[PDB]
């Protein structure tokens, strides 16, 4: 997401949760830490969404 | 010219995490625990040391008569 560009990706602010030890309970541990990364963005993105075409 | 964005003001709601909360921590319990433990001996001791002197007093009759 943050290496290559999508579709404007660029212009939002966020942190990717990254883990201690490679077994599952922190393969888990991502997977609440990035529920709460997208909020931010969902609550980003819904003030710039200029008008135009679609 | 309908489109969606409001005119300005939103949240947020934050994403972060708190919910701790205690709840007599940290030695304090040990502390009331065992200090019930306690009382409950000290209601002992007394029913059973009272119980046997009913004990005593029930094989009284029975030697009473019984000759």
Known sequence: RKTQPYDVYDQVEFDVPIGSRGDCYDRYLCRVEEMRQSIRIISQCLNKMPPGEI | ?67
């Open chain 2, 1 to 67: 010219k309908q489109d969606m964005p409001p005119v300005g003001g939103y949240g947020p709601i934050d994403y972060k995490r708190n919910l701790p909360r205690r709840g007599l921590s940290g030695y304090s319990m040990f502390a009331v625990g065992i200090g019930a433990l306690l009382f409950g001996y000290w209601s002992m001791m007394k029913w059973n040391r009272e119980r046997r002197r009913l004990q005593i007093e029930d094989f009284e009759a029975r030697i009473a008569l019984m000759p």
